[PDB]
Write a protein that binds this ligand. Structure first.
Ligand code: 3AT
Ligand code: ZN
Ligand code: ZN
Ligand code: ZN
Lengths: 1105, 46, 49, 65, 34
RNA sequence: CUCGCUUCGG
């Protein structure tokens, strides 16, 4: 009697994606920031006034961001589409306006709409013009309907703010030190101050360490300073277990050795151990005891609040910390940092909130300083802020922070880099997967261990396979398909319910109750909410209330039985995942519910409200029992997995039968497919990017995952299905190489288009002179333009439709040299390129600064050749090793000759059975005209496709009788034929091929330049020199490192040992002893640098004999 | 000499001479492409 | 061991780039450090006077 | 972008069988029987027509016009 | 002027990323390298 | 051009 199974359960996943999922994270965060958070920030800084001349003030009333507009029109705005901002290399922003009231001459003057800044507007956000638009309207706006959005456009480039990952704040962390001592640390961070305070056990006794104290001080002294003076009360708070007293005894003895027995004595000791903050201006009576008390009340343990100098809660918190340290000092239950229950994700909204708070505070400070400088000295012409409210402050700050990606917040002492990245437009999958990336707080700057590892906590939250192959392996991660990031809650009703649920106040009882076996501490965002007995009832009631709806569904409650702590988390940034609630071995979701969902009676929110599906946090799912499938459900199951294949991410969703492959193959395929060549969007023709790759005839895959259907990948395919035959042929496919069919390439297979951009600017300078373009310089001999100016039109700009060759001018730009007649020097925009290119379009625009922007879209049509990289959607990246004629290819009885011959030897080492199953399924599907599914942990089974193949008259395993094309005789072994979805990669031999003549050299050290773009030469690294030394080839090493790179001839004086010039020594004022000498130029630079450093190298020359 | 351009939404032939602010009649749109050349171009079917 | 004269290096060690696109030049750190040192020498002489 | 004129592997003319194929889809025909009626015996031409996406009209929606 | 043949047909022709002022008559490389 | 930063490739 198998348990009934809800087959349509997977239909819950699309409905969720109707409201949340892939891209809605950034969009929701930005909408919350621009609709709620900015008003909160302004309310926090609503009134600004100067100390000089009281009764003068500037009061903010309301703030608006409006719709995106362009300031091109003279003092006039105009609605602008995002594509227009892309083309004109401008920013897609909206005017930050505010209404204010202030006092000019003690008379209140109010403005109802006064611009102060510009917000770069995230695409598809609430204020973005693209929102709520139909595909026809998208076409009218020249935007692809399938574009994920969620990215900013600044100065014409698309920047994406990556989701930051960081450790949660205000949490006790017990960890071992370098010396093995098990200490504690808590980074108490409030809205104003972040301070990490530590507890050490360096000598068997506990010291508290803080940045504001000269030396770490015993914990008992701090306890005495915080109000509790009796040692017995301290010991009761620490714990009543015998080993706890045995461990804590030395601290008591150390305290008793000193004469500290009152609060005043401990405060005096701390004040002695206090350090002045660089002579803090203003002295309130030789402060010391007051300084110590203020540090205890405010600086130390900021997140723990003291009502009115009542340190009872802080005493309980530090006692709990001491108890945890003591308990962890025995059994090595050291907490791990990589556990994602302690991790938080910052989206674009929180970062933009911090940046706008900093910028607004700077703006208000500047306004106050201007008021102080102007008001008390000027005139009866009363100073008013409107004449001084510079509007470029906020706009420039936002633009620079988003564009450069480096964020410097002095108010928070936060120096972040690489926050924003250029959106990659290699393919639709590239942009979609980059849209869901997560960066780590630690960087590939060093070989760390642990974060780089795949922790089990990533289940359902982050994609296990998708990670960049290389130095950043494991430090850049991708969100799973079905995941959600929580926002902040009000935190009020949680406290109210917890108080009403029997949680005793901590102040009402002494610390001894903390040591009882049945007493459980209840926390709330790192603050001790209280104590409770019978925590099962409390947890069940809290979960029931959350299901009922009286508590926000993202509030998490978890239990730690080892520490006996009930954690209630309500802060934002936590990862959550929906799960079907299971009550007594039967899921809450039935077939009727899914039928209603399919018919449209109910949506996902209806499932949420009816206690059928609930969000689980990582900490909460630590305590739950989850069943992958219905048949796995047992008596002790609290939740059911909605769909296992949601475990994989977006890129990993492209893999057909990914569960049949080895994980490194899946990771390689994720990386490869991020770089797959294919269509970008429906507006890919009007779009002008710096580099674009298109496929001539893209085809949707024959074996498509449900993830492909969900993300509509089949609408924008990035590959072609080729009749692959798996066999060894001609020995030209030895290591990962593959053989291509010449006829297939002649018929358009793999045909690709490469679009490059060439942009020029004609700017007007400070002097009233401007860059101008000459017409083509006609040759008087032939009355035709010279070969260099052949392609230019009458206006000096190359016309679309013609072909450009190497060293030909596209724009005949000439610019003035003055900044009396103007003098123009020619700086034409030549086309550097190995092959010919065709101009597809020329775009001419004008900015507000009268700068003429010209963009040429050069197009090249490339055919696959030797060296072109090819992938097979399974991590089997390969290089086209040989292109054989069609007749040489083996053929089946039906006459089918394969396009791609791939070597069998790649399979056994990599065990990519998924590729074989995909080939079989694709063959069956194309035979019966169906699209088989290679969904993770599911999909079409082998038996069904085998039955389809035998029904259609082919072999039930794909292996087919094959006649050799060369000899005309049948092959001894059957050949594995079938359609495989091969995708071409952007790595081409034409772009990568490099050759270097003498070429240019660097000015500082006269050696060839670095890169191919700069015509640089290759580099003989240190190991190459080591290998040459090991060979013993002295002459070749000398020729390579001296003759061919930086050979030079200097003049050395044999008397003084210094370098002369032109056969003359200035130091000796003579020319008799000057001799020429061959030397590397870098050595001469080193000698001159050493001479400048007063380290004089004197060369004692001698004859070569 | 008539230099002719095509705006991005009107798609109308606009004749503008040098040093003119880029605009279009019966619109206000400011992306102004250039028309295709009249010279013959030879292509290879390969 | 105590320096009273500084050997300012030749121009080859300190290349200067004339970025005519703007009203400025790209100079390495050595030139700016030497400028600051000469400015300090002048300031000290002025203060002594 | 547009339907290729020739089949990649065999080389049978498949460009002229696209729009008529759509007619069979505008009719009641399934994919397999429509492909059979079009005369595509070997599976390579069936893959050519079945896996092709018609992006030309979507791109033309963004054409200047 | 060309130092070899004395002609004034000095053309600035870069050959594979090598800037080069060369006589257009006798091909004498007047100046090279930037 | 110099410099840094990112993303790649291997
Ligand atoms: N950081 C690096 N340093 C030196 N060589 C590298 C580096 N990254 C890649 N390579 C080159 O690539 C080669 C690594 O391939 P290897 O690790 O042996 O196979 P693989 O990448 O595991 O492929 P499979 O996943 O086994 O299919 C060897 C090395 O010459
Ligand atoms: Zn000398
Ligand atoms: Zn127009
Ligand atoms: Zn065919």
């Amino acid at each position: 009697a198998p348990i009934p199974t809800v087959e349509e359960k997977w239909r819950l996943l699309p409905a969720f994606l109707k409201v949340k999922g892939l891209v809605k994270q950034h969009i929701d965060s930005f909408n919350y920031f621009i609709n709620v958070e900015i008003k909160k920030i302004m309310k926090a800084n609503e009134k600004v006034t100067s100390d000089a001349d009281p009764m003068w003030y500037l009061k903010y009333l309301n703030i608006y961001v409006g719709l995106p507009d362009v300031e091109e029109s003279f003092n006039v705005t105009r609605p602008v589409s995002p594509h227009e901002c892309r083309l004109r290399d401008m920013t897609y922003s909206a005017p930050i306006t505010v209404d204010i009231e202030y006092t000019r001459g003690s008379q209140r003057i109010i403005r109802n709409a006064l611009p102060i800044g510009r917000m770069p507007i995230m695409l598809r956000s609430s204020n973005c013009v693209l929102t709520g638009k139909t595909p026809a309207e998208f076409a009218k706006l020249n935007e692809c309907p399938l574009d994920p959005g969620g990215y900013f456009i600044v100065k014409g480039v698309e920047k994406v703010i990556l989701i930051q990952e960081q450790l949660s704040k205000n949490r006790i962390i017990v960890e071992a030190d370098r010396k093995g001592a098990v200490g504690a640390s808590v980074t108490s961070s409030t809205h104003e101050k972040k301070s990490r305070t530590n507890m050490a056990v360096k000598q068997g006794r506990f010291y508290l360490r803080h940045n504001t104290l000269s030396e770490d001080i015993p914990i008992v002294i701090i306890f005495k300073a915080m109000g509790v003076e009796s040692d017995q009360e301290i010991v009761q708070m620490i714990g009543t277990e015998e080993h706890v007293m045995a461990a804590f005894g030395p601290s008591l003895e150390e305290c008793q050795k000193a004469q500290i027995f009152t609060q005043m004595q401990a405060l005096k000791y701390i004040g002695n151990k206090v350090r002045r903050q660089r002579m803090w201006g203003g002295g309130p009576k030789k402060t010391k005891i007051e300084e110590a008390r203020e540090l205890l009340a405010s600086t130390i343990l900021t997140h723990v609040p003291v009502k009115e100098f009542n340190f009872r809660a802080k005493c309980i918190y530090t006692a709990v910390m001491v108890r945890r340290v003591i308990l962890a000092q025995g059994d090595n239950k050291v907490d791990d940092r990589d556990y994602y229950g302690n991790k938080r994700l910052e989206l674009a909204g929180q970062l933009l909130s911090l940046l706008f708070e900093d910028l607004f505070k700077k703006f208000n400070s500047e306004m106050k300083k201007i008021a102080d400088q102007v008001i008390p000295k000027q005139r009866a012409a009363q100073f008013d802020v409107v004449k001084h409210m510079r509007q470029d402050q906020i706009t420039n700050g936002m633009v620079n922070a988003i564009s450069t990606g480096n964020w410097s917040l002095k108010r928070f002492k936060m120096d972040r880099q690489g926050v924003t990245q250029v959106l990659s437009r290699l393919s639709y999958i590239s942009a979609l997967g980059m849209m869901t990336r997560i960066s780590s707080q630690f960087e590939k700057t060093r070989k760390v261990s642990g974060p780089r590892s795949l922790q089990p906590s990533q289940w359902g939250m982050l994609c296990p396979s998708d990670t960049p192959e290389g130095e950043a392996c494991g430090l850049v991660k991708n969100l799973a398909l079905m995941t959600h990031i929580t926002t902040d809650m009000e935190d009020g009703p949680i406290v109210k319910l917890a108080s009403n649920l029997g949680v005793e106040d901590v102040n009402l009882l002494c610390g001894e109750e903390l040591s009882y076996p049945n007493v459980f501490l209840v926390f709330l965002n790192g603050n001790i909410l209280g104590v409770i007995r019978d925590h099962k009832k409390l947890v069940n009631t809290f979960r029931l209330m959350r299901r009922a709806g009286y508590i926000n569904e993202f509030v998490s409650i978890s239990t730690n039985l080892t520490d006996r702590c009930v954690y209630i988390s309500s802060d934002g940034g936590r990862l959550c995942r929906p799960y079907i609630i299971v009550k007594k071995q039967k899921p809450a979701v039935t077939n009727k519910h899914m039928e209603e969902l399919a018919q449209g009676y109910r949506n996902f929110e209806d499932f949420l409200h009816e206690s059928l599906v609930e969000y689980l946090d990582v900490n909460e799912e630590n305590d739950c029992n989850i069943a992958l499938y219905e048949h796995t459900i047992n008596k002790d199951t609290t939740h059911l997995e909605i769909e296992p294949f949601t475990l994989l991410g977006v890129c990993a969703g492209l893999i057909p039968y990914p569960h049949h492959n080895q994980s490194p193959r899946n990771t390689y395929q994720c990386a490869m497919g991020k770089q797959a060549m294919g269509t970008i969007g429906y507006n890919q023709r009007n779009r002008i990017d710096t580099l674009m790759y298109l496929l001539a005839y893209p085809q949707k895959p024959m074996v498509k995952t449900k993830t492909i259907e969900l993300i509509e990948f089949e609408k924008l395919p990035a590959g072609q299905n080729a009749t692959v035959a798996v066999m060894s042929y001609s020995g030209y496919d030895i290591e990962d190489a593959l053989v291509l069919n010449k006829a297939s390439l002649d018929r358009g297979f793999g045909r690709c288009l490469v679009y490059k951009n060439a942009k020029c600017t004609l700017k007007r300078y400070t002097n009233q002179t401007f860059d101008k373009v000459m017409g083509p310089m006609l040759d008087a001999a032939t009355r035709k333009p010279i070969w260099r100016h052949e392609i230019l039109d009458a206006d000096g700009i190359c016309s679309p439709g013609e072909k450009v060759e190497n060293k030909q001018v596209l724009v005949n730009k000439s610019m003035p040299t003055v900044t009396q007649q103007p003098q123009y020097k020619d700086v034409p925009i030549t086309y550097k390129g190995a092959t010919d290119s065709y101009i597809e379009k020329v775009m001419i625009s004008s900015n507000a600064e009268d700068a003429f922007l010209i963009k040429m879209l050069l197009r090249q049509t490339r055919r696959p050749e030797i060296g072109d990289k090819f992938s097979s959607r399974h991590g089997q990246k390969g290089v086209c090793g040989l292109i054989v004629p069609q007749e040489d290819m083996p053929f089946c009885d039906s006459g089918i000759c394969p396009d791609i011959i791939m070597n069998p030897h790649g399979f056994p080492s990599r065990m990519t059975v998924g590729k074989l199953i995909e080939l079989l399924a694709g063959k069956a599907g194309v035979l019966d005209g169906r699209f088989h599914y290679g969904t993770a942990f599911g999909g079409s089974k082998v038996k069904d496709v085998c039955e389809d193949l035998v029904r259609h008259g082919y072999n039930y395993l794909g292996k087919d009788y094959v006649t050799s094309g060369i000899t005309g005789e049948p092959l001894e072994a059957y050949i594995y034929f079938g359609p495989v979805y091969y995708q071409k990669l952007k790595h081409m031999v034409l772009d990568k091929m490099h050759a270097r003549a003498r070429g240019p050299r660097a000015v500082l050290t006269r050696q060839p330049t670095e890169g191919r773009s700069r015509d640089g030469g290759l580099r003989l690294g240190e190991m190459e020199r080591d290998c040459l030394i090991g060979y013993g080839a002295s002459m070749l090493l000398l020729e390579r490192l001296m003759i061919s790179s930086d050979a030079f001839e200097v003049d050395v004086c044999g008397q003084c040992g210094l370098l002369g010039y032109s056969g003359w020594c200035h130091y000796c004022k003579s020319s008799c002893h000057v001799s020429s000498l061959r030397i590397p130029y870098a050595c001469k630079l080193l000698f001159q640098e050493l001479q400048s450093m007063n380290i004089i190298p004197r060369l004692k020359l001698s004859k070569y004999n | 000499q008539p230099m002719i351009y095509i705006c991005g939404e009107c798609h109308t032939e606009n004749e503008i001479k040098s040093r003119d602010p880029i605009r279009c009649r019966e619109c206000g749109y400011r992306i102004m492409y250039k028309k295709r050349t009249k010279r013959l171009v030879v292509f290879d079917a390969r | 061991l105590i320096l009273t004269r500084l050997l300012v290096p030749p121009l080859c060690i300190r290349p200067s780039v004339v970025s005519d696109l703007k009203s400025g030049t790209n100079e390495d750190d050595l030139t700016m450090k030497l400028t600051e040192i000469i400015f300090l020498n002048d300031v000290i002489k002025k203060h002594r006077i | 972008m547009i339907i290729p004129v020739r089949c990649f592997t065999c080389g049978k003319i498949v460009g002229n069988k696209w729009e008529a194929y759509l007619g069979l889809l505008q009719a009641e025909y399934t994919e397999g029987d429509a492909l059979d009626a079009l005369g595509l015996k070997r599976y390579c031409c069936r893959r050519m027509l079945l896996a092709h996406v018609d992006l030309i009209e979507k791109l033309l929606n963004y054409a200047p016009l | 002027r060309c130092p070899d043949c004395g002609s004034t047909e000095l053309v600035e022709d870069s050959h594979y990323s090598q800037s080069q002022l060369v006589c257009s008559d006798c091909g004498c490389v007047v100046t090279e390298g930037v």
